Amino acid sequence: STGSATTTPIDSLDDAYITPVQIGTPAQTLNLDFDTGSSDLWVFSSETTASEVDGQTIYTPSKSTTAKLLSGATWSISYGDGSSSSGDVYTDTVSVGGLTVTGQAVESAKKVSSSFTEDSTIDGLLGLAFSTLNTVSPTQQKTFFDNAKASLDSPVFTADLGYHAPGTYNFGFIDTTAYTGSITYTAVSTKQGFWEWTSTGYAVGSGTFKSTSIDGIADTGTTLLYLPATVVSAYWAQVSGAKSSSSVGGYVFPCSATLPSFTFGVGSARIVIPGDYIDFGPISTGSSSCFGGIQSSAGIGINIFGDVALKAAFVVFNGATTPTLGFASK
């Protein structure tokens, strides 16, 4: 089997991408944030505290003839951005782009933190990291990809995120029309539950490539590219007037600037992030100070190849017995 679904930016900045997901019988369609950095499929639901729902579409398990309460199971998660959610668990039928999993754990939110409430465009998350990170207790649950893997034509999914435009998540096949050149594959460590790999270096603009190992995670659920402070400083030094602002919370630059591209290494290959992809617009409405899309990871504990980096590539998440990642230009 295979699946194919279009993923759409939630706003004009590509702050996140939503993908329609069919849950239950008859189908209830929710727009979920596919997140290769976490491993819980959770949704706004009929159980969510009413004051914490503000325009999201909700899953109502009592209206699904295939929903079954997973007795005793609870979940609770906190994300790197400080957001969080928690609740109970149903199993139900979940389909993504024509690909159907029966008995998927659908984590029903009883509580969500304010950032989820305030984003009416995201009805939940669909985690695509490794199932070892799933928060369901006392019986940990598998991700949608893990449940579908054995049925897929090939044990892979691919992320093809658009710049200011829709893109695609495919399951079970690699669309050879969707990229240019060849796909370069690179080793993955699953030790932290993430799609963790090691980039071979970087270049800023037309500058020379610096060969250096940068361990980090391929995370579709993070907007920006978070890299070591040395790398980030080297990038922003090429932008007149750019500075790190503690009050704003990262690097800002004059909205009048033209940004240089940023290249990252995948083995011997190179992926070029155009400069425009690194512009996240005024820090506040009407400001002439703009927020940068490359930021320091010094305060995180890990480097994050977020959407800024991933949307410059066609990315293969290879879930073979030994997982690997693949990157192609497009």
From Swiss-Prot:
Enzyme Commission number: 3.4.23.22
Family: Belongs to the peptidase A1 family.
Start and end residues of each Peptidase A1 domain: 17-328
Organism of origin: Cryphonectria parasitica (Chestnut blight fungus)
GO MF term list: aspartic-type endopeptidase activity
Gene: EAPA
Protein name: Endothiapepsin
Catalytic site positions: D35, S199
GO biological process, alphabetically ordered: proteolysis
Residue pairs linked by disulfide bridges in the UniProt entry: C255-C290
Keyword Disulfide bond: yes
Broad class of enzyme this protein falls into: hydrolase
Transmembrane stretches, start-end: none
Reaction(s) catalysed (UniProt annotation): Hydrolysis of proteins with specificity similar to that of pepsin A, prefers hydrophobic residues at P1 and P1', but does not cleave 14-Ala-|-Leu-15 in the B chain of insulin or Z-Glu-Tyr. Clots milk
Keywords: Aspartyl protease, Disulfide bond, Hydrolase, Protease, Signal, Zymogen
Origin organism lineage: Eukaryota, Fungi, Dikarya, Ascomycota, Pezizomycotina
Coiled coil regions, renumbered to chain: none
Shown segment, full-protein numbering: 90 to 419 of 419
Superkingdom as given in the UniProt entry: Eukaryota
